[PDB]
Design an enzyme around this catalytic site. Structure first.
Site, PDB file in Angstrom:
ATOM      1  N   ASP A 163       0.024  26.665 -55.537  1.00 10.33           N
ATOM      2  CA  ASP A 163      -0.925  25.606 -55.873  1.00 10.33           C
ATOM      3  C   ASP A 163      -1.026  25.430 -57.387  1.00 10.33           C
ATOM      4  OD1 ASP A 163      -4.160  24.793 -54.299  1.00 10.33           O
ATOM      5  OD2 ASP A 163      -2.505  23.472 -54.936  1.00 10.33           O
ATOM      6  N   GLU A 400      -0.234  34.905 -49.289  1.00  9.37           N
ATOM      7  CA  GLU A 400       0.115  33.920 -48.270  1.00  9.37           C
ATOM      8  C   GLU A 400       1.589  33.785 -48.077  1.00  9.37           C
ATOM      9  OE1 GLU A 400      -3.831  31.142 -47.936  1.00  9.37           O
ATOM     10  OE2 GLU A 400      -2.078  30.266 -48.929  1.00  9.37           O
ATOM     11  N   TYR A 455      -9.448  28.393 -43.723  1.00  6.72           N
ATOM     12  CA  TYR A 455      -9.983  27.106 -44.147  1.00  6.72           C
ATOM     13  C   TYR A 455     -10.264  26.229 -42.946  1.00  6.72           C
ATOM     14  CZ  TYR A 455      -8.560  28.393 -48.864  1.00  6.72           C
ATOM     15  OH  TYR A 455      -8.416  29.034 -50.073  1.00  6.72           O
ATOM     16  N   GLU A 491      -9.870  34.226 -49.184  1.00  4.52           N
ATOM     17  CA  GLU A 491     -10.081  32.861 -49.648  1.00  4.52           C
ATOM     18  C   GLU A 491     -10.887  32.050 -48.661  1.00  4.52           C
ATOM     19  OE1 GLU A 491      -6.499  30.802 -50.858  1.00  4.52           O
ATOM     20  OE2 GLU A 491      -5.654  32.435 -52.039  1.00  4.52           O
TER      21      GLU A 491
HETATM   22  C1  LIG Z   1      -4.171  26.628 -46.634  1.00  7.19           C
HETATM   23  C2  LIG Z   1      -3.648  27.213 -47.932  1.00  7.19           C
HETATM   24  C3  LIG Z   1      -4.756  27.265 -48.980  1.00  7.19           C
HETATM   25  C4  LIG Z   1      -4.292  27.769 -50.343  1.00  7.19           C
HETATM   26  N1  LIG Z   1      -4.287  29.236 -50.299  1.00  7.19           N
HETATM   27  C5  LIG Z   1      -3.599  29.739 -51.497  1.00  7.19           C
HETATM   28  C6  LIG Z   1      -4.305  29.305 -52.762  1.00  7.19           C
HETATM   29  O1  LIG Z   1      -3.445  29.570 -53.855  1.00  7.19           O
HETATM   30  C7  LIG Z   1      -4.495  27.814 -52.785  1.00  7.19           C
HETATM   31  O2  LIG Z   1      -5.253  27.501 -53.956  1.00  7.19           O
HETATM   32  C8  LIG Z   1      -5.208  27.410 -51.513  1.00  7.19           C
HETATM   33  C9  LIG Z   1      -5.540  25.961 -51.633  1.00  7.19           C
HETATM   34  O3  LIG Z   1      -4.946  25.043 -50.888  1.00  7.19           O
HETATM   35  O4  LIG Z   1      -6.360  25.600 -52.450  1.00  7.19           O
END
Ligand SMILES: CCC[C@@H]1NC[C@@H](O)[C@H](O)[C@H]1C(=O)O
Ligand SMILES: CCC[C@@H]1NC[C@@H](O)[C@H](O)[C@H]1C(=O)O
Lengths: 587, 587
Positions: A163, A400, A455, A491
């Site tokens: 990201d 991830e 999420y 997260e």
């Molecule tokens: C569904 C994956 C979510 C993702 N998870 C890793 C973080 O590095 C990102 O910031 C986060 C995002 O989409 O904000």
């Protein structure tokens, strides 16, 4: 290797800010050996800072390739009888450096220091030319990975899979350092608790004595020899055991701060000194308004003031190693830290849009054996320099990763096992992505406590909290019974632009952030195994451009200039309502 | 005069929206008698709406002078044997209207209807030209007052002394109305309670019968004659007494909704049906994003939904008479209403800046005898048309007048006394401005319950809540002991732009609105005599341009497009926490 601290060991900080900077668009530097003469047609740059946003120029910002720093320095006069060695605390991605026409260093790794003795290329009293060549390219054998793409015209453009934005440059401290001519390298300490013991190992050029002094620094016990064990009888007490090197004719003294640190994992509990704990706090980022990822003391003091006010007692160095200053701070202030390396983007299932990426994740085309060994080097450097910090409470191998494809566990098994070989004192995790759920993930077996980035209600439950709660709870219970580990939600968050208010509690509004986070909190309250909550980002940060990101990732509790959204007062009420380290029970 | 309601009484609503509109910059209309021919060089305008912002043009927006509306209409065919009369429900400031070359009406008053029989100038079945001349100028004999200024070039520019912007045009309903040829004018009803009686008066052309029917509209009691008394045995029950006019050959039926309304003031209590009450709610405004002050059913339904959600049970028609639709709504929904006339700006001490206004407030140069009589006319019209509404609970003579200068009480005494002569059923107030404090105000003696508009912590205590609380409380206690009246805080609020967040709780931030309003709430909780709280504005509204106003007055709880600031959830928690009509006691 560990951080330079000064006593009869000295240094001249070379974060002199303004160096000569130049881009190398047509790759002439190495061949014309630019380090040989003063940079042609340069501009001033700041050296604790990313080069991307300092010039308000889109063509420096999105630049891919080689860039050049240069700076002349006078070596202090009282060093003529010393070893002069040159340390960069972080060159993001790749750096190679020449001390006056002679090449001295090279390093592939964006968040770890690298140093080298240049005493035979310097003499105290005069001025030397320092030239640095910094590369910001990612391939499949880099940490993190990526794919450079060269178009029809020969223009490079970098593609990656994480990201945050691919900021680069000299992000942290440059340092000239001198130490007496016998002691060079490392020291390691390990601590135990009995419901009070230690160990030592020094590597230097001669006899070693060590004495543990306390915060009043009166000696509380002393030994001397590379090993053995002493015993003793919100924020944390840090003793100081002062290790001395008696040898040749010159003595050398190094001070290393130690904290009574203890913990492994026990059933479903993350204990600390045999105490259950609840992590509260944040996934962070090194990202600010004009410095990119450049460290800055003001920012550190302010954002610690914010986490302190909000009640967080912990955080996680999301997606790369942080400025060591922050772990020293966490040391003195008793902040619990999950240390993570730069191994993000091992996943090709996350990119979403309307746009040829490799077809088989684990294979020679992508993550190969070279990738696994560069990875092991990254884990090696992170542990090698953050091993003695009490604040580091857990290592995290990667973030991830895609574990559905074939070959995933063949890749990650030697890394988990090797890291347990690298330090058995702290637990091992690998943060898990949404779509490798409880019925699917391959690698969760190999780690001490599993960390989930979920999420529901945002990416997969279309803004419907009432179903998202149910999904998230099943999946919770499922995970625990499948592994009976502690669960730390590393997260959880939603994009919300400060200022968007809505009576309908719609996605992107501040009301939706509040409602969503507190529903997540309600399920946390009701499941035994969750021992931690760290919301997805403390502040908004920059990402590469795309139809999913409005000027960056807006998932922060604070705006990029550190102003609080409404949820900042939601969390502050919950995280300071519980008592410290204890989870709110179900109502 | 009261509102047309349809049964065997008929109408064709002429809010046909699009009329022909034209400005009259060089004052040619009257002399060329423009009503005579179709407007030359016109543009389409909407007729429930202000003319100012409908064309996105600064030169129509800030225009001063005469403007012209025109619209042709076919009179329905079944009216040939009827009186055809033409009613405008509100022409803001001044209107004069010609029905096909013959002048029919003229009226000075911006928020009250005016009607006139035009049966001898119409015949049913054909199309007539309606032309309206609307004036938006204020002098010292207007309600509200102002000063037009003509510069060196002959250009007019209007100066006034109230906050809200001087929107003008046809803001409310136009109406062709027919009623049978005997009943013309007014009816009045008065209601009593016995810890259950009524009265009637009809003015028409012949015998009158009246029958009170209830919500199931079965007759609950009947009399007939212009007077006498019947008796009977969150939101309010509204009976319906149906008055009939038996005479000539044709009968006429008018339905008038009545509510069992009771109240005077008793010591320090605003009772209702012998019940203590706490007002909660808002000072409002007729102000929306593109219609100016133009009434709109959607907006009314939505903002009542917002006040309902937030828990307000009352409001005050700030600074001019409102759309009668809102008082019918307040009737059916049991909203308590403080009815105020357009008499604002009787004060030259409030304007703040770097810029010749008259030196003596009460004198011939400014507010003179003509001013007092135009004022009495305004009070006369407001009571004349809102007398039978149960929701009207109190009249308010004026808002924030300057009572320090000499002559203030000589002016306001005959108006208070005359209004008590105009209706003794409901109490009388005059909202008090900040700087005529308890030791200074001249006129508070003459009114039933005094209403205070105070802004300690904003305009006078420099953003310091901790002193502002103390000042506000002394002044509270002082006011009560000086008059032992109930105190309704009619205005209290601070400018806050949605989106401004601040850890420092600074002025203009949402945190500051929350903290400020709740500190005010803490002192309210502790003083006996305050029986009401209405925050200063529900939504942000437009004002004339100045260095104190960022795109309008930002003191609203909601933004101009009706989105909630953080304080909207503060109030909602307090106003729905208390029980209905009862004040939270001190903790
Ligand atoms: C569904 C994956 C979510 C993702 N998870 C890793 C973080 O590095 C990102 O910031 C986060 C995002 O989409 O904000
Ligand atoms: C200190 C005078 C305050 C003033 N009171 C009258 C209202 O019409 C205005 O809106 C309000 C304001 O300044 O907002």
């Amino acid at each position: 290797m560990l951080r330079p601290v000064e006593t009869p060991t000295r240094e001249i900080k070379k974060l002199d800010g303004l160096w000569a900077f130049s881009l190398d668009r047509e790759n002439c530097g190495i061949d014309q050996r630019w380090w040989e003469s003063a940079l042609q047609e340069s501009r001033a740059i700041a050296v604790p800072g990313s080069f991307n946003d300092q010039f308000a120029d889109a063509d420096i910002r999105n630049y891919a390739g080689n860039v050049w720093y240069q700076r002349e320095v006078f070596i202090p006069k009282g060093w003529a009888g010393q070893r002069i060695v040159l340390r960069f605390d972080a060159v993001t991605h790749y750096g190679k450096v020449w001390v006056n026409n002679q090449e001295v260093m090279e390093h592939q790794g964006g968040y770890t220091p690298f140093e080298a003795d240049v005493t035979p290329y310097v003499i105290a009293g005069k001025s030397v030319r320092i030239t640095v060549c910094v590369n910001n390219e990612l391939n499949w054998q880099t940490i993190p990975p990526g794919m450079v793409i060269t178009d029809e015209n020969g223009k490079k453009k970098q593609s990656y899979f994480h990201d945050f934005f691919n900021y680069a440059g000299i992000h942290r401290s440059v340092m000239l350092y001198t130490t007496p001519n016998t002691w060079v390298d490392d020291i390691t300490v390990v601590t135990h608790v009995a419901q009070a013991s230690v160990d030592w190992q020094v590597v230097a050029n001669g006899d070693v004595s060590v004495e543990l002094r306390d915060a009043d620094q009166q000696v509380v016990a002393t030994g001397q020899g590379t090993s053995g064990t002493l015993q003793v009888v919100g924020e944390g007490y840090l003793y100081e055991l002062c290790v001395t090197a008696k040898s040749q004719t010159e003595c050398d003294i190094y001070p290393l701060r130690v904290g009574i640190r203890s913990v492994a994992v026990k059933g479903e509990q993350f204990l600390i000194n045999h105490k259950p704990f609840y992590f509260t706090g944040f996934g962070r980022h090194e990202d600010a308004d004009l410095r990119g990822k450049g460290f800055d003391n003001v920012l550190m003091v302010h954002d610690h003031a914010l986490m302190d006010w909000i009640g967080a007692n912990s955080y996680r160095t999301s997606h790369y190693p942080y400025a060591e200053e922050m772990l020293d701070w966490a040391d003195e202030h008793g902040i619990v830290v999950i240390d993570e390396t730069a191994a993000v983007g091992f996943n090709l299932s996350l990119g979403i849009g309307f746009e040829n990426k490799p077809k088989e994740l684990y294979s020679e085309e992508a993550v190969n054996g070279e990738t696994q060994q560069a990875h092991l080097q990254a884990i090696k450097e992170l542990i090698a320099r953050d091993k003695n910090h009490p604040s580091v409470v857990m290592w995290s191998i990667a973030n991830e990763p895609d574990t559905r494809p074939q070959g995933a566990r063949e890749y990650f098994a030697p890394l988990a096992e090797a890291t347990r070989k690298l330090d058995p004192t702290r637990p091992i995790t690998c943060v898990n992505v949404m779509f490798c759920d409880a019925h699917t993930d391959t690698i969760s077996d190999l780690f001490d406590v599993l960390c989930l980035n979920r999420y529901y209600g945002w990416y997969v439950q279309s803004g419907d909290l009432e179903t998202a709660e149910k999904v998230l709870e099943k999946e919770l219970l499922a995970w625990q019974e499948k592994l009976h580990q502690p669960i730390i939600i590393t997260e959880y968050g939603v994009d919300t632009l400060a200022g968007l208010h809505s009576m309908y509690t719609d996605m992107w509004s501040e009301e939706y952030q509040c409602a969503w986070l507190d529903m997540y909190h309600r399920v946390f309250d009701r499941v035994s195994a969750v021992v931690g909550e760290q919301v997805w980002n403390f502040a908004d940060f920059a990402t590469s451009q795309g139809i999913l990101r409005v000027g960056g990732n807006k998932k922060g509790i604070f705006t990029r200039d550190r102003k609080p959204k409404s949820a900042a007062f939601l969390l502050q009420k919950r995280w300071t309502g519980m008592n410290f380290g204890e989870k709110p029970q179900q109502g």
